[PDB]
Structure formats: C-alpha cells, structure tokens
C-alpha cells in the first residue's frame, strides 16, 4: 500500500458501523450521511476536484449501498439487514415486488460474500474501487480517477497476500464480485423505475415538484 | 343548461397560445380548467388530482388539434413545428407516428371543433377513475353532464352525422394510450439516461 494505505480504509469503513421498499425509500436520506463520511476518509478522494468528486458520488451511490448491506447480512441466516435497524425476510420481500431482486442479492452477493469470509478491509477496498470509477460521466480529469483506482486494488492485492497466504486466488475472487454488484445495482433501478410507472400517475416527479394549489392563484 | 358548450368553448379560446415548457403548460392547464363550468366548485383537493392526473392527456389533445393545420407535422405550444426526420431521429419516431395517424389525422377528417375538442378535454378531465378522489361520484355527474351536452351539440350542429358523437368519444382510447407511450418513453430515456439516473429522486 504505497500510496493508498489499507489501514486507513478500515478506519473509514468502521466509522459508520410492514413492507421493505418504503423500508429503504424513507430510510436512505440517513445514509446520505453514512455515504459521505465514508467517502471523506478514503485517501486521495478529498483531493480531487469538486466537479469530479460529486460525480463519483452519484455514480456509485447505487452499488455502495448495496455492497454495504450485502456485507452486513453475512451475520445472519437467510435475510437482509438494513441500516435502519430493519431486518427483511424473503417471504416478506417477495411481496412488495422485489422478490427477484432480493434473491439475487442473497445468492449472488451475500452468500458468495459469506462463503469467502469477506472482511471489512475487503469490503472497504471493493467499495473504494467502485467509488473511484473512471467510466463515470463527465470527469474533468478522468485519467486521474483511474490512477487512484490502481492504487486501491494494489493495496488490496497485498493485504490479501497477508492475511490469507494459502489462497493465492482470493484477490481475483474478490474482483469478480464487482460484476454481480454492478448488475444488481441496475436491476434495482429497474424495479425502482417500474414501480413508478406502473403504480401511478407518474409524471409528477418528472414534472418537477407539485404546487398547483396556487393552481387557484 | 347544467354544463354549457358555449362556456366550454370560451375556455379553449381563452388559452390559445426539450421543453423547459410547463411553467407554461401549468398555466395553460389550470387557467383552462378553471373556466370549465363546475370545476372550481370541487373540493380543492380533488381539483389537484384531476389536473395532475390528466395532465398528460390534456396537453396531447391540445397539440394535436393545433397541428392539423400543419402538414405531416406537429406544432407544439411553443409554436414549434416538429417533423418526422426531426422526430424519428430523436427517438420518438414511434410516438410521432401514432400521434398523427391515430390522433391528428382523424381530427382532421372530421373537422373537429373547438367546442367538440374542448368538450372532449373536459371528459378526460373529470375522470372518476382517478385515485384518491375525495368522493368519485360527484365527478361522474360532472362528466355525465358534459357528454349530454356534447351529444346535444352534435345533433343540432350536425344532423346528418348521426355518428358524430361516438366518433368523437371514440378518440379517447387512442388519446389515452398515446399518453402511456409518452410515459414509457420518458421513463426509458431516464433509465437509459446519461451519467446517472435516479439522481432523480428529489431526496
């Protein structure tokens, strides 16, 4: 970890120690907080340009949450554990229209996450990897963000070598979970968008915000 | 007359004129709606549901009638003529085609009327299937009143076209679907959309 030290990141991750869908809709403003503190404490992040910094945040918002709850649920058997102190269940989840998304998460993300004894330093580094995403839209100095990235996994490779010597394929194994994270991140957007369209007169959010009471001006 | 076409007409006449449109659409829609004969007698709360509910259909009907004058094109409220090439290239070719075939052309064929159009707009507006209505029934009576009047006008004005009333009413299913397709399109573009989506949540 020459430049992006692994040790800082664990500190960074550690700092933040009825139907489920509202479960997160009402809930996530709270983790606007958690998300920002977390990004603050990664090593070269604060030093990037502001224009660039925000882009990463919106960009990685999707996955970073997911990754986080994915990891916390390893602690439990057959369930999802929210930041709100809410624990969700399959038979429950299966009923607000996200039955499919919830399973992918457990089978695709958690179990696999669990089966490898993923640990917070690992969780943190992966998350750091997503955050510093070069493919993000409109960065003024992208080749810059790409560079930060290399440093993160590089440290990551090293840490792996340390704690877990017998397994030399762990680093690769970790990286291979990112696709699953990314696909799951999109599928979520798909559930989120659908419920909007299907559910109701939806124009509204698109119409920016409602004030017709002064309809009667 | 419980609901008079003359009043319904005045409302249309009263509002004759990539969209950071809509502060304007909002003004046009509410100002038009207020003149509909029994609209402001409604619980204020219902009035919000209705305008918002039928917001998409009401505009669409509007540009279509305006557009008949244009040839193979649609004229937005902004006063901007849109054409196939422009439209088909820009991703809405599917919608534009329907609007003309399904909507504008038919309106053209029948020499649809401002009264008739305004009347069709009112029916759409007083929609009782709208979720959350304080009490839906009151709205149905208002809707029921509009078609009765509309029925009457056609005969008086168009005795030869006994078929005119249903013909007019029969455009509603077309107008409705076009609306949902517009929505499907608006949603896809956001989903597909550049940089990040869901940025969209207003917290």
């Amino acid at each position: 970890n020459e430049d992006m030290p692994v040790e800082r990141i664990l500190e960074a991750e550690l700092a933040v120690e009825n139907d489920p869908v509202t479960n997160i809709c009402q809930a996530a403003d709270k983790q606007l907080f958690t998300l920002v503190e977390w990004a603050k404490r990664i090593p070269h992040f604060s030093e990037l340009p502001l224009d660039d910094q925000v882009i990463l945040l919106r960009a990685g918002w999707n996955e970073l949450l997911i990754a986080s709850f994915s990891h916390r649920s390893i602690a439990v058997k057959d369930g999802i554990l929210l930041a709100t102190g809410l624990h969700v269940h399959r038979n429950s989840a299966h009923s607000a229209g996200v039955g499919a998304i919830f399973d992918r998460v457990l089978t695709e993300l958690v179990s696999k996450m669990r089966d490898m004894q993923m640990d917070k330093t690992e969780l943190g580094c992966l998350r750091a990897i997503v955050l510093f995403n070069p493919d993000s839209k409109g960065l003024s100095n992208p080749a810059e963000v790409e560079a930060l990235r290399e440093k993160v996994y590089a440290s990551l490779e090293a840490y792996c070598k340390h704690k877990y010597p017998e397994q030399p394929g762990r680093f690769a194994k970790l990286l291979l979970r990112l696709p699953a994270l990314r696909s799951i991140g999109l599928k979520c957007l798909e559930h989120l968008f659908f419920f909007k369209l299907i559910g109701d007169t939806p124009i509204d959010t698109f119409l920016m915000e409602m004030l017709e009471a002064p309809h009667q001006m | 007359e419980d609901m008079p076409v003359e009043r319904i007409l005045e409302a249309e006449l009263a509002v004759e004129p990539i969209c950071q449109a809509a502060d304007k659409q909002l003004f046009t829609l509410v100002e038009w709606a207020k003149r509909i004969p029994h609209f402001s007698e409604l619980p204020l709360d219902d009035q919000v549901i209705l305008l918002r509910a039928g917001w998409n259909e009401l505009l669409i009907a509007s540009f279509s009638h305006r557009s008949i004058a244009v040839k193979d094109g649609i004229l937005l409220a902004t006063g901007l003529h849109v054409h196939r090439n422009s439209a088909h290239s820009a991703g809405v070719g599917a919608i534009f085609d329907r609007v003309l075939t399904e909507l504008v052309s038919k309106m053209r064929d029948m020499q649809m009327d401002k009264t008739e159009l305004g009347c069709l707009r009112a029916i759409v507006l007083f929609n009782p299937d709208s979720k959350g209505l304080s009490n839906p029934a009151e709205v149905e009576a208002l809707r029921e009143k509009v078609y009765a009047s509309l029925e009457a006008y056609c005969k008086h004005k168009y005795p030869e076209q006994p078929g005119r009333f249903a013909k007019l009413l029969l455009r509603l299913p077309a107008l409705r679907s076009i609306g949902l397709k517009c929505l499907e399109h608006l949603f896809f573009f956001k989903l597909i959309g550049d940089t990040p989506i869901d940025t969209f949540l207003m917290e």
Partner: peptide, 7 residues
C-alpha cells in the same frame, strides 16, 4: 448537484 455538494 447542489444538495450533494455539502460534504
């Protein structure tokens, strides 16, 4: 995004 940029 203005809301976002409160860091």
């Amino acid at each position: 995004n203005m809301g976002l940029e409160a860091i």
